Design a binder for this molecule. Structure first.
Ligand SMILES: C[C@H](CCC(=O)O)[C@H]1CC[C@H]2[C@@H]3CC[C@@H]4C[C@H](O)CC[C@]4(C)[C@H]3C[C@H](O)[C@]12C
Ligand SMILES: C[C@H](CCC(=O)O)[C@H]1CC[C@H]2[C@@H]3CC[C@@H]4C[C@H](O)CC[C@]4(C)[C@H]3C[C@H](O)[C@]12C
Lengths: 199, 179
């Protein structure tokens, strides 16, 4: 299928290289850029919830360290977070793609960061909100109705799992940022290789 | 420069092969050697940290044994020298914490940054000279901490090399996605 005898003018070569550089920017770099931007915004809003949590935790019980946790306030904050990003996917930025295109980018970004979701007849790679869903299930398992008092043992157990899901989102965001950095360098190197064919 | 000049696909293949080879030589093989030299150095520092069992003149014997061993073992380049700006781009790429641009003459190298072992010596002489169970262990905390920073310098370098390999692997994937 390789044909070494195929001839191309230098002018045709310049235009084909230009066309390919544009395609790779539109279909690869800009895709990564929006995915990073979307996850970054989600984790920024989660971090505001984190700041708000300090107001939802306060000394409780009688003498000593018990913690009163405003569970319904935290619960609705995380529910509103999921609701804000239901329609802000990692890919694509606008409209939808086919299932194969979505699965392709699901694989590239990672099945723990994204999740393929059907919008209309088309598909998107949504932000995978499993860490938030885990926090909400864990909150519902604290029981109580609205507000719960947690002794040291139960506060430490709840907080350890909550922080681990926060850490997971941080790890996810770090991996996405590193992948976008690498994609930028893959693009730079492709430009250099293609330009070398003109040398 | 003449847009009408014709070029064959097999000529294009040879130019792309040339550029792939250049990237391996100029980028990947540079990272690999830097990982190698900082690894061998930190592995030799693990020598003296495992021999802590045995006092202070014992330690300097083997601690600037180390600095001496690696003064002509730069991170980059492997052989000969480069210009100052070439050394500065690779120091930028590898990190000012782990390397230091150094003028031999004939040109410049990016030597291994030996400040963790300098820092350890400053604290070594600082104390005096026997240490009680209280401030022997404060010292060992400072010593163990510089081990940790060299340890972490190595880790960060290995990660950058891993990412550089990924970049190369993906470049080759793109270029071979038709064949
Ligand atoms: C292998 C990738 C595939 C990227 C894509 O999906 O287009 C592409 C990217 C740029 C492509 C090349 C562009 C210049 C050349 C165009 C000529 O007509 C003959 C083949 C060349 C050398 C192309 C070969 C190859 O098709 C390339 C290297
Ligand atoms: C980009 C051209 C042409 C592709 C096309 O015309 O569609 C292809 C054709 C021959 C290809 C090479 C063949 C040998 C090598 C195979 C390796 O697994 C990747 C690097 C090499 C050096 C290839 C790199 C490159 O992928 C080439 C040069």
């Amino acid at each position: 299928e390789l044909d070494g005898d195929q001839m191309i003018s230098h002018r045709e070569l310049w235009a084909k290289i230009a066309n390919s550089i544009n395609d790779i920017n539109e279909q690869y770099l800009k895709v990564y850029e929006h995915a990073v931007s979307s996850y970054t915004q989600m984790y920024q809003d989660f971090s505001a919830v984190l700041s708000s949590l300090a107001g939802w935790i306060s000394p409780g019980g009688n003498d000593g360290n018990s913690v009163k946790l405003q569970v319904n306030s935290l619960k609705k904050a995380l529910e509103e977070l999921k609701e804000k990003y239901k329609d802000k996917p990692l890919y694509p930025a606008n409209n939808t793609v086919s299932q194969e295109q979505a699965n392709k980018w699901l694989t590239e970004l990672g099945g723990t960061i994204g999740k393929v979701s059907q919008k209309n007849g088309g598909y998107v790679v949504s932000i995978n909100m499993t860490p938030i869903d885990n926090m909400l299930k864990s909150l519902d398992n604290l029981g109580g109705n609205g507000e719960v008092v947690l002794d040291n043992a139960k506060y430490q157990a709840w907080n350890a799992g909550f922080s681990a899901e926060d850490e997971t989102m941080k790890n996810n965001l770090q991996t996405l940022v590193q992948k976008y950095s690498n994609a930028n360098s893959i693009f730079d190197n492709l430009v250099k290789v293609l330009s070398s064919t003109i040398s």
